[PDB]
Amino acid sequence: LAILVFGYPETMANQVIAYFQEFGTILEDFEVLRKPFVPIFSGNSWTKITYDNPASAVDALLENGAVFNGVLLGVIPYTKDAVERLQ
């Protein structure tokens, strides 16, 4: 149910997270999604994002290769192995 989004300049992270809310409710407590528990895994140019349901993840994944404000975004299914190699 989680994806890894990647390839963006760090200055752009929140815009990217915000965009990915369009696919489903996000479980991580990112500041930019906060109204008025999964833990946040992220680094420079990548974040894990976790949805409520399989449909949302499947739909987000279709954004793989999309151009977003002049950069290419990557989207892949989350795996423990990948996040481990990144940290």
CB count in 10 Å sphere of residue 69? 11
Q: Which amino acid is at 60?
A: A
Experimental determination technique: X-ray
Q: What is the DSSP letter of 51?
A: B
CB count in 10 Å sphere of residue 29? 11
Q: Domains of the chain: which residue ranges? A: 1-87
Q: Resolution (in Å) of the shown entry?
A: 2.3
Which of the four CATH numbers 3.40.1500.10, 3.40.1280.10, 3.20.20.140, 3.30.70.330 does domain 1-87 have? 3.30.70.330
Could you tell me the CA-to-CA distances from 18 to 13, 31, 58, 87 in Å, in that order? 9, 10, 17, 24
Please tell me the distance from the alpha carbon of residue 62 to that of residue 57, in angstroms, as a whole number. Answer: 9
Query: Is residue 7 a contact partner of residue 74, using CB atoms and an 8 Å limit?
Result: yes
- Residues ≥6 apart with Cβ < 8 Å to 29: 37, 40
Query: Is residue 76 a contact partner of residue 61, using CB atoms and an 8 Å limit?
Result: yes
Beta bridge partners of 74: 6
